[PDB]
């Protein structure tokens, strides 16, 4: 088995699918987690980016991407899976064609810009598929509607469809604790029946320990009960006990 996980940001795959990644590695699968929006960023930073850097426990003008890449490597090494850091800039570092920052909340902009980004991400994913030759791709459902998650999900769907590789979407955590869960896929795609995994306690522990490697995100993610909320979420999906993660297969719609 060759499992390619496609994470929007540096932490999403571990937060949402860390137990599944860890189990896959345990079972002897070759597992690679490619993070789309891991692109190097340098000052000048927007005021919004400077504020986020502060929330992440960094100086406003620090190399936040460098810090997060190192966190990601530690977390993924802890799960014993490989990493690959993509070239795309996180939403807080992107500019619009007219020179404005993308984020301020997202500034009004042309769908053309969204399409162009999705196209480039899709190009990179098609190349990674050629290079890694995955038997399964898993990426985010984009529950919560973060534009980077939506771009990642849509690009992965288009790339996998063209390359004829099976794809599944994970339930975005911790977002799904606060959202309804319904998502709007690009035309022609739909979700099949959910799978709710049940993993051994060791895999829960491995996942939670890996999450902790993302120290910069802990204040943001905890709001001080992140792990309790993750446990409660799994409990609600599997009342008989045991930790797990929800994923859906993505298939072609009828008449498409
Ligand atoms: C960014 C668009 C507005 C909606 C707010 C959603 C909550 C923010 O979410 C975050 O945003 C960042 C910047 O993209 C990231 O670097 C993070 O990993 C992430 O958790
Ligand atoms: Zn994210």
From TrEMBL:
Region annotation (Disordered) ranges: 235-256
UniProt binding sites for Zn(2+) 5: 171, 233
UniProt keyword terms in alphabetical order: Acyltransferase, Glycosyltransferase, Ligase, Metal-binding, Transferase, Zinc
Residues given in the record as Zn(2+) 1 binding sites: 9, 12, 149
Binding locations of Zn(2+) 3: 83
This protein's record includes keyword Transcription regulation: no
Annotated positions binding Zn(2+) 4: 109, 114
GO biological process per UniProt: glycoside metabolic process
Any one GO molecular-function label of the UniProt entry: metal ion binding
InterPro entries hit by this protein: GlcNAc_PI_deacetylase-related (IPR003737), LmbE-like_dom_sf (IPR024078)
Annotated Zn(2+) 2 binding sites: 9, 90, 148
Xref: PANTHER family: BLR3841 PROTEIN, N-ACETYLGLUCOSAMINYL-PHOSPHATIDYLINOSITOL DE-N-ACETYLASE-RELATED
Name listed for the protein in its UniProt record: LmbE family N-acetylglucosaminyl deacetylase
Organism per entry: Actinoplanes teichomyceticus
């Amino acid at each position: 088995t060759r499992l390619l996980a496609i994470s929007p940001h540096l932490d999403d795959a571990v937060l949402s699918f860390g137990a599944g990644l860890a189990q896959a590695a345990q079972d002897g699968a070759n597992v690679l987690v490619y993070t789309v929006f891991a692109g190097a960023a340098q000052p000048p930073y927007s005021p919004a980016a400077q504020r986020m850097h502060t929330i992440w426990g960094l100086a406003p003008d620090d190399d936040a991407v460098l810090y997060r890449r190192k966190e990601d490597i530690a977390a993924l090494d802890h799960l014993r899976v490989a990493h690959r850091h993509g070239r795309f800039l996180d939403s807080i570092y992107r500019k619009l064609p007219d020179g404005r920052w993308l984020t301020a909340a997202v500034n009004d902009h042309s769908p053309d810009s969204d399409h162009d980004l999705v196209g480039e991400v899709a190009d990179d994913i098609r190349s990674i598929i050629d290079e890694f030759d995955p038997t399964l791709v898993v990426t985010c459902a984009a529950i919560g509607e973060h534009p980077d998650h939506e771009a990642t999900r849509d690009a992965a769907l288009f790339a996998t469809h063209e390359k004829n590789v099976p794809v599944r979407l994970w339930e975005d955590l911790p977002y799904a604790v606060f959202k309804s869960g319904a998502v709007e896929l690009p035309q022609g795609f739909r979700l099949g029946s959910a799978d709710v995994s049940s993993v051994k306690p060791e895999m829960r522990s491995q996942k939670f320990q890996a999450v902790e490697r993302y120290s910069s995100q802990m204040v943001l993610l905890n709001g001080n009960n992140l792990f309790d909320r993750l446990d409660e979420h799994a409990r609600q999906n599997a009342p008989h006990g045991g930790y797990g993660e929800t994923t859906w297969p993505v298939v072609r719609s009828d008449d498409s």
